[PDB]
Amino acid sequence: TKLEEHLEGIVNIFHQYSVRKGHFDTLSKGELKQLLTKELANTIKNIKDKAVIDEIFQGLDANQDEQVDFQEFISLVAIALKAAHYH
Template identity: 70%
Template structure:
């Protein structure tokens, strides 16, 4: 497996690590998304301990407004974080 493929698999595994409800391995509820963000992205996303921030992130990601974030919806967050990290590297 290449380094990039390994990292992609890692993102999938992190998602599954937090989608822990029995029978719901492909969606995150707000509590699970908050745990993922606060534990896995504490230096990347600001104000993650603020519930209003978590609510806004969740609302923005939950495109179909079903009260859950699917992996496809979660990838939007990953993409945004990657773009920001890329932009910040070029500012240094």
Template identity: 75%
Template sequence: MSKLEEHMEGIINVFHQYSVRTGDFDTLSKGELRQLLLKELANTIKNTRDKETVDKIFNGLDANRDQQVDFIEFTTLVASVLKTAHENIHQE
């Protein structure tokens, strides 16, 4: 497996690690997303402990307004974080 394929599998595994807490492997509840943000992106996203920040991120990701973040919606967060990290690397 290539390095990129390993990283993609890692993203999928992280999503599943947090999505299984309420029994649905394909979606994250707001609480599950909060835990993921706290443990996996605390150094990247500011104020992950702040309820307003989590609410804003969750509402921005929940495109179909079903009160769940599915994997496709989650990839929006991953893409946004990657874009910002890429921009920051070029500013160094």
């Protein structure tokens, strides 16, 4: 269905970035920065700012292991959707 395609698209984008360095199924700080700056530039304010990126990663990394896993990444999608819906 159309909803299922969107969901699959989000998962695909997660991996677009997660496979690039280190573990294939988690985002490093560097991978997350790339994902945020290139994919959410029109969604989150000042995403180009280091401080902004840094607080987002910290907020997402709930077990503070320096990676953002898929379950943690769902939190970002929720932030992004709330922003998108305000549009």
